[PDB]
């Protein structure tokens, strides 16, 4: 789902992209381990600003 990456993880990321990934990746790689942010429809526009 709509999580945006931050790191040099393998080829679905380019230092930040909106993707449609499976649930394990989001929760058990990206929720609480780091490298991402949840899509609260505010954080995505905030990091679009950043």
């Amino acid at each position: 789902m709509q999580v945006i990456l931050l790191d040099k993880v393998a080829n679905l990321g380019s230092l930040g992209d909106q993707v449609n990934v499976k649930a394990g990746y989001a929760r058990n790689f990206l929720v609480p381990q780091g490298k991402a942010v949840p899509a609260t429809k505010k954080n995505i526009e905030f990091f679009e600003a950043r």
Binding site: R27, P32, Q33
Partner: protein, 77 residues
């Protein structure tokens, strides 16, 4: 207890209806699972008995605003 700590879901009593409509009491058990979380703020592995629907809610919101209302209603972790 089998209580979803995030959404508040708990088992309720239902009935397994037959073809002859014989009533038998049964409780619907929510898909509850224990999963460990790693908070960068407090430097600790916290585990929570949540549902998969609670997992989807905490994927939508985030761990911090969920803990902000877990500290509210007397929950322990």
């Amino acid at each position: 207890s089998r209580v979803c700590q995030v959404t508040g879901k708990r088992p309720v009593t239902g009935n397994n209806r037959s073809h002859a409509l014989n009533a038998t009491k049964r409780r619907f058990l929510p898909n509850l699972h224990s999963h460990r979380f790693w908070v960068e703020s407090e430097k600790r592995f916290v585990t929570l008995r949540v549902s998969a629907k609670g997992m989807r809610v905490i994927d939508k919101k985030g761990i911090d605003t969920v803990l902000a209302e877990l500290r509210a209603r007397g929950e322990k972790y």
